């Protein structure tokens, strides 16, 4: 291999991205399905650098986004095993990971956030043409991706996830006390908790909050698309309930890394007693929320 060869393979990846963007309808018609799958599997080689693996994951995400709901079982299984460190997905063949699926600088299981930020800003590159297409294709791909992520990764990420929060039919109870998790007080000495899969919850809640605190438009190159994804997050009843439930899951984390809760406090300060969005203006049923502020 050479730097010229590295640039050639990067240009091959860029041409792959361009051919996915320029021809979404052809991809939706499973064009070169076996060839695309083989190319993705070859590019998903774990023996290369972190950049190569990230590019392969990005290309796989774009391919499944353009394919929408036409992805087969192996695409879903690969998608469910894209981020390592998670338990092997219970498939028909059996437990498996990405390494054994493709083969039938230390990673700190932080590839979840990189994967999520790749999914976000590359869903918004809008492989949908919008010509010979419709405006609905802007929202459909991201809705499908969010639904799949919530179906697969969310239940394991949130072991305490449950369905209580709902503005419509507002059933309310009285919360009670909770025990104290053990703090190892190890490694200024920052603290942590022995409960597995907690940093993933912190990252997920922080990202959800940053989409809502969603101020100052620092990036300035992906801001209209952030507004688009904000509308997607608040454009349906189900996503409304999901946002309320993730906020309820917030404020429940242990004392370690509690600054995320204050972010939710700032979000609610911006919402109530301030500019009130359509979210509080007075199964998905209607796009308009029209939820009373009292509930």
UniProtKB/Swiss-Prot annotation:
PTM Phosphoserine: list the residues: 214, 217
Source organism's superkingdom? Eukaryota
Listed transmembrane segments:
none
Where does the protein end up?
Cytoplasm
User: What assembly does the database describe for this protein?
Assistant: Component of the heterodimeric RalGAP2 complex with RALGAPB. Heterodimerization is required for activity.
Task: Name the job this protein performs.
Answer: Catalytic subunit of the heterodimeric RalGAP2 complex which acts as a GTPase activator for the Ras-like small GTPases RALA and RALB.
Q: What is this protein called?
A: Ral GTPase-activating protein subunit alpha-2
Its lineage reads: Eukaryota, Metazoa, Chordata, Craniata, Vertebrata
Task: Please state the gene responsible for encoding this protein.
Answer: RALGAPA2
Part of the intact protein present: 74 to 510 of 1873
């Amino acid at each position: 291999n050479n730097k010229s060869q590295r640039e050639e393979l990067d240009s091959i990846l860029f041409l792959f991205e361009k051919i996915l963007q320029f021809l979404p309808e052809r991809i939706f018609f499973r064009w070169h399905y076996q060839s695309i799958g083989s190319t993705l599997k070859k590019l998903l080689h774990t023996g290369n650098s972190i950049k190569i693996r990230c590019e392969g994951i990005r290309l796989f995400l774009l391919w499944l986004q353009a394919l929408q709901t036409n992805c087969a079982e192996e695409q879903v299984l690969i998608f469910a095993c894209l981020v390592p460190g998670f338990p092997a997905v219970m498939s028909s063949r059996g437990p498996c990971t990405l390494e054994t699926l493709i083969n039938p600088e230390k990673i700190a299981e932080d590839q979840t956030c990189f994967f999520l930020q790749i999914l976000l800003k590359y869903m918004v590159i809008q492989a949908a043409s919008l010509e010979w297409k419709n405006k609905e294709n802007q929202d459909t791909g991201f809705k499908f991706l969010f639904t799949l992520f919530r179906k697969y990764y969310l239940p394991h990420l949130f072991p305490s996830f449950t369905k209580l929060t709902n503005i419509y039919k507002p059933v309310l109870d009285i919360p009670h006390l909770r025990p104290k998790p053990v703090y190892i007080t190890t490694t200024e000495n920052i603290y942590s908790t022995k409960i597995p899969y907690m940093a993933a919850r912190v990252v997920f809640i922080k990202w959800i909050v940053t989409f809502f605190s969603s101020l100052c438009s620092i990036e300035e190159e992906h801001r209209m698309v952030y507004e688009m994804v904000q509308r997607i997050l608040l454009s349906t009843r189900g996503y409304v309930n999901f946002v309320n439930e993730v906020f309820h899951q917030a404020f429940l984390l242990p004392s370690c890394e509690i600054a995320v809760t204050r972010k939710v406090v700032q979000v609610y300060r911006k919402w109530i007693l301030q500019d009130k969005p359509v979210f509080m203006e007075e199964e998905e049923e209607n796009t308009n929320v029209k939820a009373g502020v009292q509930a």
